[PDB]
Design a protein around this ligand. Structure first.
Ligand code: HEM
Ligand code: HEM
Ligand SMILES: [Cu+2]
Ligand SMILES: [Cu+2]
Lengths: 145, 142
């Protein structure tokens, strides 16, 4: 549960909320298409890919709106954990989805996807990823026995 | 564990479930909708879940003699229940609706010894599900 959210990360993530209000669906859909074509093993995980795309778009927006208080997203984090565990999402998938999410941001935001903004979102992603993946491992261990 | 008599009756129910499980599951959802409106919050995709429960009833009866072939399906049920917020106190409510759906779909075949066998079979599965959901709930608190 180690990683953290620096002051600069929070400021830049907070500032992208206007772009996410307009483009989070484009970012989420583009992210999933890059994942579909770069890592075909993962397509077996998505029962309803269209529905998940709009859920992730909302989560990105909500997460950016609450980057100063991540604990206010406890219920939504719970949903993500149990959805992932239901589908068999694994710890090693998280680098792949970041790779596709980085390039989704680079594509949709065009010039506004500066390297500082991408580094802020990488840290915000790594925080959320480390929290989701560790709680999922715990849930897996409980259902094994 | 389940008595020999209720396992013979669950086995005898497989023909009814291969033809009517959808009707039983749909009627059971429609009854739950009208009798306990607080639960409608829990269902995001009611149509899809009706068909998933129908297939789970059929699979449960078809392997009533070793519920371990349902290990993957039980996992899915447990994680979907946790994700939706299903509680131990909900299981009596869905039994009353499943019993009345069996009564309605099986008609005269839904005698009281058949319904008693399904009460025992449901209670076994509900116990297995709800205890695993409590363990999952406890870890989400950490
Ligand atoms: C920080 C990283 C991630 C975030 C923020 C995120 C976000 C979400 C959200 C909000 C949902 C919908 C949950 C719901 O409300 O039902 C979801 C579901 C899903 N995600 Fe992700 N996710 C992440 C990582 C991943 C990874 C690494 C994979 C690997 C393939 C993945 C694949 C899936 C699948 C298959 C589902 C649907 C599972 C189900 O509904 O049963 N996600 N995710
Ligand atoms: C022995 C009892 C039960 C059985 C056999 C059963 C069966 C199932 C199955 C097969 C699913 C879908 C699994 C999947 O998503 O792949 C499901 C989900 C669900 N069940 Fe039940 N269930 C039981 C008890 C209950 C109870 C008591 C409630 C209380 C309202 C309930 C409400 C729900 C809801 C809301 C979902 C959807 C969860 C989601 O989609 O995230 N279930 N159940
Ligand atoms: Cu769409
Ligand atoms: Cu139907």
């Amino acid at each position: 549960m180690a990683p953290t959210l620096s002051e600069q990360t929070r400021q830049l993530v907070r500032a992208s909320v206007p772009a996410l209000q307009k483009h989070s669906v484009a970012i989420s859909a583009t992210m999933y298409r890059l994942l579909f074509e770069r890592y075909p093993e993962t397509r077996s995980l998505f029962e309803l890919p269209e529905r998940v795309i709009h859920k992730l778009a909302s989560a990105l927006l909500a997460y950016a709106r609450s980057i100063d208080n991540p604990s206010a997203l406890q219920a939504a984090i719970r949903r993500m954990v149990l959805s992932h565990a239901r589908a068999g999402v694994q710890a090693v998938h998280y680098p792949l989805v970041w790779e596709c999410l980085r390039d989704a941001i680079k594509e949709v935001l065009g010039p506004d996807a500066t390297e500082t903004l991408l580094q802020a979102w990488k840290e915000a992603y790594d925080f959320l990823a480390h929290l989701l993946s560790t709680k999922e491992a715990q849930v897996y261990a409980v259902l094994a026995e």
